[PDB]
Amino acid sequence: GSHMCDAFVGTWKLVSSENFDDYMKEVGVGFATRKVAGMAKPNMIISVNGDVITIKSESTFKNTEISFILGQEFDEVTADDRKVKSTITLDGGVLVHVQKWDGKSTTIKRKREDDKLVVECVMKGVTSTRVYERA
Numbered sequence: 054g055s056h057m058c059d060a061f062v063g064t065w066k067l068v069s070s071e072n073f074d075d076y077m078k079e080v081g082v083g084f085a086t087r088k089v090a091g092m093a094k095p096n097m098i099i100s101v102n103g104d105v106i107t108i109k110s111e112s113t114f115k116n117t118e119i120s121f122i123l124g125q126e127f128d129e130v131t132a133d134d135r136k137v138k139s140t141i142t143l144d145g146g147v148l149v150h151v152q153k154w155d156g157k158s159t160t161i162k163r164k165r166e167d168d169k170l171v172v173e174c175v176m177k178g179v180t181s182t183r184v185y186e187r188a
């Protein structure tokens with residue numbers, strides 16, 4: 054039945070963001086996409102069915118969805134429209150998501166902290182923190 058990844062399951066809404074514009078600059082997102090993406094207030098819906106985890110993000114800007122098995126690489130289309138190769142693992146209760154494309158890498162960590170789901174994104178020393186709460 055239960056799995057430790059079950060504390061991520063649910064419907065989550067973005068409540069705060071820090072330095073996301075600069076993170077997007079470092080990833081290579083252009084001006085217009087940064088402005089519109091930075092405005093959005095996505096909801097993230099996280100579900101598990103057997104070994105498959107699904108993370109859906111719905112917003113006024115873009116909708117994105119990934120389904121994956123921990124430790125098994127997959128192809129992802131990001132919200133900013135990169136085509137990346139991704140691997141997601143669980144390390145000490147933290148979901149660690151690495152995206153690789155064009156010789157570049159970014160890492161997105163998702164952790165449960167109190168009643169929050171905290172998303173920490175890093176690229177070449179630039180970090181952003183985005184905090185989600187239950188919807």
Ligand SMILES: O=C(O)c1cc(Oc2ccccc2)c(OCC(F)(F)F)nc1C(F)(F)F
Nearest residue numbers: 080090093095112114132133161172174183
């Ligand atoms: O989960 C996040 O909030 C999040 C959201 C992203 O894009 C959006 C933004 C607004 C609405 C819908 C999707 C995003 O896009 C990749 C980017 F940032 F490179 F553009 N990356 C992340 C994250 F890095 F942190 F995972």
